[PDB]
């Protein structure tokens, strides 16, 4: 599979191997607050943990992506799709961040890519995924573009993505699309 995603101010390209500096800072910084506690790992477990991701991606059963800004094609994020499933046709998605070098769209125009990627590239059917519970600058980002709140646990809100709302989105966020 190639893919060739690309949004009006940013776009992705596969994770390789030397992104894991990129990666392993990306998720300390976004970690980084008040609370910051054990390094949950380092460059090299972070290549490797990507070493054995490509035979996942090999295998057509998982795809990490690096997100760029268009301008000067620069690393702004990551996003990932993964646990993929039949009957149906089923993707989630996640390790979704974005650095403070994003474009001010980065957030929704790597959104309708990943959707891009899911529905049109790959063939699903819907896209199944989790939200924290209390993180609610998310949760209203995904209403807001279509996802239904399907049911909840202790600490998560869990979402479907309908290909209905796929199509729609190409037509309402077609600026963003670029």
């Given at each position: 599979?190639?893919?060739?995603?690309?949004?009006?101010?940013?776009?992705?390209?596969?994770?390789?191997?030397?992104?894991?500096?990129?990666?392993?800072?990306?998720?300390?910084?976004?970690?980084?607050?008040?609370?910051?506690?054990?390094?949950?790992?380092?460059?090299?477990?972070?290549?490797?943990?990507?070493?054995?991701?490509?035979?996942?991606?090999?295998?057509?059963?998982?795809?990490?992506?690096?997100?760029?800004?268009?301008?000067?094609?620069?690393?702004?994020?990551?996003?990932?799709?993964?646990?993929?499933?039949?009957?149906?046709?089923?993707?989630?998605?996640?390790?979704?961040?974005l650095n403070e070098h994003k474009t001010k769209y980065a957030a929704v125009e790597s959104?309708?890519?990943?959707?891009?990627?899911?529905?049109?590239?790959?063939?699903?059917?819907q896209s199944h995924f989790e939200v924290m519970k209390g993180n609610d600058k998310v949760?209203?980002?995904?209403?807001?573009?279509?996802?239904?709140?399907?049911?909840?646990?202790?600490?998560?809100?869990?979402?479907?993505?309908?290909?209905?709302?796929?199509?729609?989105?190409?037509?309402?966020?077609?600026?963003?699309?670029?």
């Amino acid at each position: 599979v190639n893919f060739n995603l690309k949004a009006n101010t940013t776009y992705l390209r596969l994770v390789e191997e030397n992104d894991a500096e990129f990666i392993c800072t990306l998720r300390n910084n976004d970690k980084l607050n008040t609370y910051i506690s054990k390094s949950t790992g380092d460059i090299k477990s972070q290549a490797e943990w990507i070493r054995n991701y490509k035979n996942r991606e090999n295998n057509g059963e998982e795809y990490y992506f690096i997100i760029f800004r268009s301008d000067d094609q620069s690393p702004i994020g990551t996003v990932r799709l993964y646990d993929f499933h039949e009957n149906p046709k089923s993707f989630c998605w996640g390790s979704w961040i974005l650095n403070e070098h994003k474009t001010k769209y980065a957030a929704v125009e790597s959104a309708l890519l990943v959707y891009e990627a899911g529905f049109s590239t790959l063939g699903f059917e819907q896209s199944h995924f989790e939200v924290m519970k209390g993180n609610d600058k998310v949760h209203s980002f995904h209403l807001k573009m279509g996802a239904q709140k399907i049911s909840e646990d202790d600490e998560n809100i869990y979402y479907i993505f309908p290909k209905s709302k796929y199509k729609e989105n190409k037509i309402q966020y077609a600026r963003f699309l670029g």
